[PDB]
Design an enzyme around this catalytic site. Sequence first.
Site, short mmCIF file in Angstrom:
data_model
loop_
_atom_site.label_atom_id
_atom_site.label_comp_id
_atom_site.label_asym_id
_atom_site.label_seq_id
_atom_site.Cartn_x
_atom_site.Cartn_y
_atom_site.Cartn_z
N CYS A 51 4.12 -59.06 18.42
CA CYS A 51 4.37 -59.55 19.86
C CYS A 51 4.06 -58.73 21.07
CB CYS A 51 6.01 -59.90 20.09
SG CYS A 51 6.40 -61.35 19.47
N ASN A 90 10.96 -66.94 23.51
CA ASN A 90 9.52 -66.11 23.14
C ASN A 90 8.90 -66.77 21.95
OD1 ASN A 90 8.63 -64.05 21.66
ND2 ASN A 90 9.90 -63.67 20.28
N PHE A 127 12.09 -68.86 18.71
CA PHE A 127 11.47 -68.64 19.07
C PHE A 127 10.44 -69.54 19.59
CE2 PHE A 127 10.71 -65.90 14.84
CZ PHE A 127 10.72 -64.36 15.02
N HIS A 186 8.16 -57.89 27.22
CA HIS A 186 7.85 -59.41 26.37
C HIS A 186 9.22 -58.93 25.76
CE1 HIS A 186 7.31 -61.77 23.33
NE2 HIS A 186 8.22 -60.92 22.78
C1 LIG Z 1 19.97 -61.33 17.93
C2 LIG Z 1 20.66 -60.98 20.20
C3 LIG Z 1 19.91 -62.21 20.44
C4 LIG Z 1 22.25 -61.90 18.94
O1 LIG Z 1 22.61 -61.11 20.32
P1 LIG Z 1 23.60 -60.50 20.85
O2 LIG Z 1 22.90 -59.06 20.53
O3 LIG Z 1 24.18 -60.33 22.61
O4 LIG Z 1 25.42 -60.37 19.79
P2 LIG Z 1 25.20 -59.48 18.37
O5 LIG Z 1 24.66 -58.70 18.08
O6 LIG Z 1 26.87 -58.77 18.42
O7 LIG Z 1 26.38 -61.43 17.21
C5 LIG Z 1 24.42 -61.11 16.69
C6 LIG Z 1 25.13 -61.71 15.43
O8 LIG Z 1 23.34 -62.55 15.06
C7 LIG Z 1 23.26 -61.44 13.86
N1 LIG Z 1 22.16 -60.66 14.48
C8 LIG Z 1 22.00 -60.36 15.45
N2 LIG Z 1 20.03 -59.63 15.03
C9 LIG Z 1 20.14 -59.74 13.90
C10 LIG Z 1 19.11 -60.02 12.98
N3 LIG Z 1 18.30 -58.73 13.32
N4 LIG Z 1 18.91 -59.60 12.24
C11 LIG Z 1 20.05 -60.59 11.39
N5 LIG Z 1 20.99 -60.58 12.27
C12 LIG Z 1 20.90 -60.28 13.06
C13 LIG Z 1 24.17 -60.41 14.07
O9 LIG Z 1 24.85 -59.63 13.11
C14 LIG Z 1 25.80 -60.63 14.36
O10 LIG Z 1 26.14 -61.98 13.65
P3 LIG Z 1 27.59 -62.58 13.57
O11 LIG Z 1 29.30 -60.94 13.24
O12 LIG Z 1 28.17 -63.08 14.99
O13 LIG Z 1 27.69 -63.35 12.52
C15 LIG Z 1 20.48 -60.18 20.26
O14 LIG Z 1 21.06 -59.12 19.75
C16 LIG Z 1 18.95 -59.33 20.43
O15 LIG Z 1 18.36 -60.18 21.19
N6 LIG Z 1 18.40 -58.60 19.07
C17 LIG Z 1 16.72 -58.21 19.21
C18 LIG Z 1 15.68 -59.35 18.50
C19 LIG Z 1 14.35 -59.13 18.52
O16 LIG Z 1 14.54 -57.94 18.09
N7 LIG Z 1 14.10 -60.39 18.28
C20 LIG Z 1 12.27 -59.45 17.89
C21 LIG Z 1 11.39 -60.60 18.59
N8 LIG Z 1 10.05 -60.58 17.54
C22 LIG Z 1 8.86 -61.41 16.52
O17 LIG Z 1 9.32 -62.63 17.36
C23 LIG Z 1 7.93 -61.25 15.53
S1 LIG Z 1 9.02 -61.21 14.26
C24 LIG Z 1 7.96 -62.15 13.09
C25 LIG Z 1 7.41 -63.01 14.63
C26 LIG Z 1 7.08 -64.02 15.24
C27 LIG Z 1 5.70 -64.40 15.78
C28 LIG Z 1 5.89 -64.90 17.05
C29 LIG Z 1 7.04 -65.65 17.61
C30 LIG Z 1 7.74 -65.73 18.69
C31 LIG Z 1 6.55 -67.05 18.83
C32 LIG Z 1 5.22 -66.61 18.42
C33 LIG Z 1 5.15 -65.95 17.22
O18 LIG Z 1 5.44 -63.89 14.98
N9 LIG Z 1 5.84 -63.15 14.30
#
Ligand SMILES: CC(C)(COP(=O)(O)OP(=O)(O)OC[C@H]1O[C@@H](n2cnc3c(N)ncnc32)[C@H](O)[C@@H]1OP(=O)(O)O)[C@@H](O)C(=O)NCCC(=O)NCCNC(=O)CSCc1cc(-c2ccccc2)on1
Lengths: 379, 378
Positions: free
Chosen positions: B150, B324, B201, B291
């Site tokens: 990305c 994204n 995605f 991005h």
């Molecule tokens: C995630 C949000 C929206 C949440 O929103 P929030 O923060 O406001 O609220 P919160 O955090 O308080 O709550 C959220 C709830 O979800 C859980 N939670 C959050 N985060 C993770 C995680 N990381 N793991 C496991 N659980 C996770 C929490 O634990 C919580 O769980 P619960 O307690 O509520 O049940 C926010 O954090 C945020 O943007 N974060 C940064 C996201 C990020 O890095 N994107 C990187 C993108 N990279 C890629 O595309 C490349 S990769 C493989 C690949 C893909 C491609 C490709 C892609 C697209 C198109 C074409 C090709 O090519 N290669």
Amino acid sequence: QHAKILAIGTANPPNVYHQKDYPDFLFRVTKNEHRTDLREKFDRICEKSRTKKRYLHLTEEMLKANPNIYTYGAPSLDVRQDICNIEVPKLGQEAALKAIKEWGQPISRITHLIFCTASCVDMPGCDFQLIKLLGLDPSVTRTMIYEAGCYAGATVLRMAKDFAENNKGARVLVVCAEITTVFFHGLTDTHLDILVGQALFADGASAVIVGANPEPEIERPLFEIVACRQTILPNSEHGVVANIREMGFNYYLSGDVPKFVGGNVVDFMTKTFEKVDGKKKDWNSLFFSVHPGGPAIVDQVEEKLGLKEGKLRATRHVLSEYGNMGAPTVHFILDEMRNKSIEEGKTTTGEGLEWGVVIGIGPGLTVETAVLRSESIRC
Amino acid sequence: QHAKILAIGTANPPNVYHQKDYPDFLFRVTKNEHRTDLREKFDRICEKSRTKKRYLHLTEEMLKANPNIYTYGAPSLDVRQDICNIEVPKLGQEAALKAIKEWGQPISRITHLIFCTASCVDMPGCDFQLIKLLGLDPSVTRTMIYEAGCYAGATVLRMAKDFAENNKGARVLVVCAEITTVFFHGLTDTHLDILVGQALFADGASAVIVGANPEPEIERPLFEIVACRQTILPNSEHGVVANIREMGFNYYLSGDVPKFVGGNVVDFMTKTFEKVDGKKKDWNSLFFSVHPGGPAIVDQVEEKLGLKEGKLRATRHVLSEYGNMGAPTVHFILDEMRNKSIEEGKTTTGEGLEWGVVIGIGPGLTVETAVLRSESIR
Ligand SMILES: CC(C)(COP(=O)(O)OP(=O)(O)OC[C@H]1O[C@@H](n2cnc3c(N)ncnc32)[C@H](O)[C@@H]1OP(=O)(O)O)[C@@H](O)C(=O)NCCC(=O)NCCNC(=O)CSCc1cc(-c2ccccc2)on1
Ligand SMILES: CC(C)(COP(=O)(O)OP(=O)(O)OC[C@H]1O[C@@H](n2cnc3c(N)ncnc32)[C@H](O)[C@@H]1OP(=O)(O)O)[C@@H](O)C(=O)NCCC(=O)NCCNC(=O)CSCc1cc(-c2ccccc2)on1
């Protein structure tokens, strides 16, 4: 002030497979001794291969532990990738350290990294892994060329030329590394192309340092990268095909590839030299690094360009001693040519001649040429 | 005479998935309606995604015909590749024709092609397939960037800059195309990262024409590509990982990625602009294409650079309307910025400002920045 090749290093896996022994090994370890029909065909291919030995990472123990690798069509990509994603950067590291030693500058002067491999794919890539292994600056500017194929030894020089010439002071580390474990397949009369790859494909890595404006008394150019051209040979899309599948990297090779190369070589040579001086005949005036995709490709270039006996000695030497290692092979050939030129007391690294060419040939069919000038023999 | 962006075109698959409906769709078609635990987690992620809709090639009929795609861990790479190796070049072709139309020159004038995708891999590659589809000169000079991820929407501009500036008269067609069918996975409590990718995605393609020395009264520049820098953020190798496997392209995403970006943005911005001028930059004087890997990445850039309200509007608009889409996304954002600048009567394509930046963020973690200048609207 054109980009120059300032160093070349090479490396191969430690295990040597002499061609005289390889039919016996292949048919035994893949449990195919009953296929006397295929053994006859393979013996004939090996006899014509003009390859005396090859270095391979793959061992019999790896096959015994992962028999799906030799079971045609069985799922095996994951075990192949687990090997190659580690071994490709490691082999590249060995070649790179040799190139860096020849170059004679600190690693901190490397500003750009081109890594090329058709043997694996991962995110982050081999370039990232090599940065870790070598301790390159974390802000090196990277180009990671995955699954281009056998024209890429010329392509990476073209890319390095543009990066080195457009970025003042840049020093480009170019690493091409191949581990053919991912391409190893078992034997079936429905896919005889595998017999050709089993006879010819081999493992190796090259590393080249490219930079414009060599630093006096530290850096010593070997070749100058003058002009490059990439082209697709008409009506040859079936020539070389490779697909990334659950069974590994599968490949198909048309028996007509040598004829396509021979049918186009005068044209692609002429159009390449149109970018320089308009040379259109008397090809024996040049030195050559020809990707030896197989022996018949080398023979076609020699015949259709009217090359004299021995003109392609360095190319044939590398095919004999190492096989077809993919993209790095043309860099092994330039290194061999430089070494033999030293041995013979030639005035230049290009067999005493001033002008030469690198010819890469791969899927498309795509041919990339790089016109080089040699350099005086020094340090 | 720096390299200039002379045209931008974009494309997406025809199927629109509104985020309000996506949890119901995902859990129904993958037969996971009993997983009330996973459904609540996915609802929360979608609510925070700041993504209103996405375009996707994948349809329910494709999942019904190939249920291995939603059966976690089942062998499915071959069917995914059979789709993506065709659909990625076709979507890129659509974007390329739009860019070429804007540019206004014949296809025969293109000398270089850069094709970028993380959605498939084949030999010959997508670049070769696009040459066939468009009728590009068979001697175009090609760069085929597979599986970078990305940060590559900035990287391809850096590469195009060098090719355009070092080859007199060169005209570079750059195409980034993504079809996330290869990344679609089913749901398991052992691999919750999939819930994040399932929410964010999306599919899309961009095309950019790059050349130095535009022909007066014939070509019109939109942006100038001034200087670029690529760097690895320390201690973040686990941030974004993707492996090419029998089950498709599997991926892992660390929850710490936003904090890593925020912890490095002042540094990477400062070191990038040191390549252009020795004076300190006021970050609010710039226009931005960031991005939007997720909404929190955008918030981190805003916070640590002290950006004023609305500075990242174009970035957030694209995330909202498209999701994204990987590498093409920053090009969609530049196009949006140019279009909004026309709408608002701004004096430049960069929101009326002179200097700007493209920030690509991907595996490594790797950040590539490209410093831009805007151009007069004309
Ligand atoms: C995630 C949000 C929206 C949440 O929103 P929030 O923060 O406001 O609220 P919160 O955090 O308080 O709550 C959220 C709830 O979800 C859980 N939670 C959050 N985060 C993770 C995680 N990381 N793991 C496991 N659980 C996770 C929490 O634990 C919580 O769980 P619960 O307690 O509520 O049940 C926010 O954090 C945020 O943007 N974060 C940064 C996201 C990020 O890095 N994107 C990187 C993108 N990279 C890629 O595309 C490349 S990769 C493989 C690949 C893909 C491609 C490709 C892609 C697209 C198109 C074409 C090709 O090519 N290669
Ligand atoms: C094969 C020899 C030595 C034999 O010598 P000969 O053919 O001249 O003599 P003859 O024809 O009289 O006898 C030979 C008998 O063998 C049979 N026979 C020959 N040819 C084929 C074929 N094509 N199919 C099926 N049967 C074939 C005939 O049937 C004939 O039998 P019969 O016709 O007489 O009955 C010679 O031809 C020759 O050099 N050929 C050119 C081969 C060629 O394409 N090299 C390009 C290599 N491309 C690639 O690696 C890229 S791909 C996937 C990939 C791989 C990598 C990579 C590779 C290495 C390292 C790291 C990465 O990255 N990507």
